[PDB]
């Protein structure tokens with residue numbers, strides 16, 4: 001939301017780390033060379049300071065060197081594989097045999113009218129992992145398999161699988177770690193470590209790299225593009241050096257190289273596969289392609305595994321679910337058909353309390369707060385626009401919800417019909433649970449915070465069951481209105 | 494549903510082709526050798542007739558040869574990578590350097606307590622295609638890209654992308670074909686070509702092969718497994734020879750080699766990637782892995798592309814959709830709020846007629862059949878159990894629906910609430926459209942059948958819009974019942 005740091009950016013503090021433009025840093029890592037040329041002219045417009053040393057040509061010779069002579073054979077392939085107007089996610093990787101360096105790696109992605117050239121040095125078990133990931137019984141089983149496969153392929157010290165909760169909080173679900181280092185498995189980190197701007201950037205560009213955290217980046221001369229005199233968009237460039245403050249934060253943990261692979265499910269960021277190395281370690285591209293393959297495989301397989309796990313969790317509860325669905329879809333008066341203990345809707349969701357608000361009057365079951373608190377909760381629920389309200393913490397959402405915590409801390413509510421006039425409420429008592437939070441900060445050890453007023457997190461199977469119950473109750477709403485309209489007509493005339 | 498052909502199977506006719514067990518044919522292709530051994534003992538139980546020639550050992554020596562001596566180093570990996578009880582989809586591929594053949598391909602998948610060994614001979618653009626598939630603007634654009642990539646990788650004569658309609662009918666959406674052969678693009682084939690048993694088998698095993706249609710298969714001695722004296726499940730074996738009648742059917746078209754890659758979306762078969770070759774052409778495994786990679790990439794990318802295409806189709810219609818959603822969610826009397834031409838719900842779905850059945854009385858718009866036909870259609874809709882009924886053909890579904898075809902051939906109906914008491918009906922006039930059907934049969938030329946009494950197929954965006962409209966109307970049903978209950982109470986007392 002601000003101009004770039006090198007050309008009019010505000011001073012970077014902890015609070016405004018979300019305002020720092022990381023996609024346009026104006027610098028690249030020193031492990032490769034970057035060239036920028038027009039996609040229609042073929043003349044290099046922007047170059048890196050290390051480009052002259054990397055290519056072996058003098059900087060004066062580099063200026064004005066046409067890409068046709070620069071790339072004797074890759075130019076027709078560059079035009080054919082990258083027509084103008086393609087999305088920035090389209091990358092073309094070709095192995096150009098530069099005589100000075102022998103075999104060299106070339107990767108090009110087009111942003112607007114500019115062609116960005118990325119130059120990097122370059123020189124069977126993947127199918128077994130391909131089949132192993134697809135045979136994971138559950139999501140948790142898949143995590144260690146994927147992390148171990150990544151560690152075997154790369155050799156990184158701490159191969160960690162990063163998972164993001166819906167509230168933009170990250171938790172570690174797996175860790176392939178070399179013996180000796182402290183295990184970070186189970187730690188949950190806040191949203192401050194990964195800004196929302198990264199999440200916006202992370203879904204479009206899945207793989208990144210950091211050759212060395214102690215290596216100083218090099219600038220691009222000229223800094224601004226000659227075409228538009230604007231900051232150069234370097235978001236899609238792997239050679240782009242990450243944020244210097246993030247570099248220092250990584251240095252605080254003594255990490256030389258840090259690679260992260262994004263996992264995108266249904267167009268939204270699901271998690272990361274972070275890797276750390278004590279010593280700097282450049283990565284050949286032919287296995288970075290393998291890492292991208294693994295990332296896509298993981299993104300597909302986590303969806304499949306969540307579907308299977310939801311089906312299995314629902315499998316435990318057909319008798320309760322089928323019984324309540326049969327006993328609620330054909331109920332003319334749900335008050336007398338849902339409040340009986342025979343159905344036992346309280347135990348279906350494993351909740352301490354339940355509110356039956358139908359026909360205006362509300363009937364409560366189990367552990368419920370005093371009546372004025374019930375009316376306050378009902379009014380607050382009516383203020384909620386969403387049809388289904390799910391929360392494991394009424395204390396944070398409701399301004400003084402800690403008072404209800406002795407009776408109910410977590411809440412799952414479904415609104416029959418719409419407008420919250422007729423709603424079902426599930427009340428979950430508070431459970432004192434502590435989750436370790438990691439610790440720019442310098443503490444990266446175990447730190448458990450005594451955590452106030454949440455309940456047991458709602459399983460996705462429970463949410464699916466709530467959605468199904470709401471759907472069937474809203475379906476029975478039609479028969480309810482039909483019979484009440486018959487009564488209206490018969491009693492009016 | 495029947496015993497195997499070689500040991501008590503009924504004679505194979507055109508009608509009972511769905512009863513032929515293809516997963517247990519008892520024979521394999523002659524391009525490789527198959528060994529079957531116990532997963533706990535290590536002794537080969539079943540072998541192929543060609544196994545002795547392939548391995549270079551006499552059949553007497555082959556019998557009783559322990560896998561530990563047979564595989565000096567792969568046995569510990571076989572046990573580690575294949576624990577007992579794993580699903581049949583788990584395959585372990587290892588390159589065993591057999592001295593007789595030099596480099597040999599070994600692939601093992603476990604079914605029950607038996608270990609099936611598959612032996613086959615063996616000796617950078619994939620990432621570019623990886624990125625090309627992800628950058629396809631639409632599903633149709635992705636099809637030619639995928640087919641061309643497959644043709645470039647393999648070199649097959651006719652690389653065809655096969656797509657299955659929800660009614661188990663297949664249509665060709667792309668074709669990468671060598672110059673000279675007749676293009677099969679656009680042809681639609683019935684469900685007889687691919688039996689439902691194949692569809693059940695095709696979702697679990699994605700890739701198959703046929704080295705030569707004129708090559709006679711070889712049997713396994715003994716035919717039955719020594720462990721259970723039962724037919725050997727060869728469904729997961731690539732070396733399994735396909736159905737001989739299917740071999741003859743493929744021979745009718747003069748195809749030497751025929752490979753098909755399954756596309757599975759959300760656990761159900763979405764389509765196939767069929768390839769045909771005039772001459773036999775065995776396929777090295779290191780590129781069959783690439784083909785599997787492409788199949789998984791296609792399965793993910795078709796989901797993404799359908800989501801994007803549905804979003805784009807809905808993008809055209811916010812004004813109509815937002816206007817009707819605002820004007821229907823807060824309607825106390827939908828009869829006077831939905832029947833006005835200002836909303837123009839007829840043009841939103843591009844339909845020739847519409848029925849507004851609320852409060853018992855039904856109001857019709859546009860081209861509608863005579864009243865007795867309307868009552869018959871309403872009763873038939875009430876007989877339908879599903880909440881949403883979608884069909885482009887009322888002629889087939891409704892026993893004498895061709896009479897309504899002059900007024901409406903296709904129908905899209907949404908039931909407000911449940912029980913079809915209050916429903917919305919969209920009526921689509923008949924359009925005379927012809928789609929070529931290909932032609933075991935011997936005709937594989939152009940054949941267009943004059944096709945009776947269907948309308949324009951319902952776009953997925955239209956179905957999503959219908960679902961959203963039904964959801965919002967069922968939500969407004971709650972306010973309807975609330976106000977009518979207030980009226981009931983106020984007029985009763």
Ligand SMILES: *C/C=C1/C(=C/c2[nH]c(/C=C3[NH+]=C(/C=C4\NC(=O)C(C=C)=C4C)C(C)=C\3CCC(=O)O)c(CCC(=O)O)c2C)NC(=O)[C@H]1C
Pocket residue numbers: 014017018022184189192193194195198208209210241242243246249253258259260274275438440441
């Ligand atoms: C307020 C801003 C902050 C900040 C900036 C920042 N961080 C990233 C990217 C990452 N942050 C991560 C966080 C962690 N690293 C760890 O080692 C642990 C725990 C052990 C955590 C929670 C991670 C993993 C990344 C991804 C980078 C990688 O590892 O490859 C960015 C995005 C930069 C880019 O994409 O180039 C930014 C701007 N980091 C903070 O900690 C706060 C102060």
Ligand SMILES: *C/C=C1/C(=C/c2[nH]c(/C=C3[NH+]=C(/C=C4\NC(=O)C(C=C)=C4C)C(C)=C\3CCC(=O)O)c(CCC(=O)O)c2C)NC(=O)[C@H]1C
Pocket residue numbers: 507510511515677682685686687688691701702703734735736739742746751752753767768931933934
């Ligand atoms: C009533 C049974 C029949 C039958 C049996 C059958 N067919 C398959 C598999 C396939 N059938 C296909 C159909 C076509 N082949 C073509 O060339 C065309 C059109 C140009 C069509 C529509 C295809 C493509 C397959 C997949 C095989 C491949 O190409 O690799 C099976 C399954 C066998 C197995 O999985 O091993 C069976 C039992 N085929 C018929 O045509 C009818 C008479």
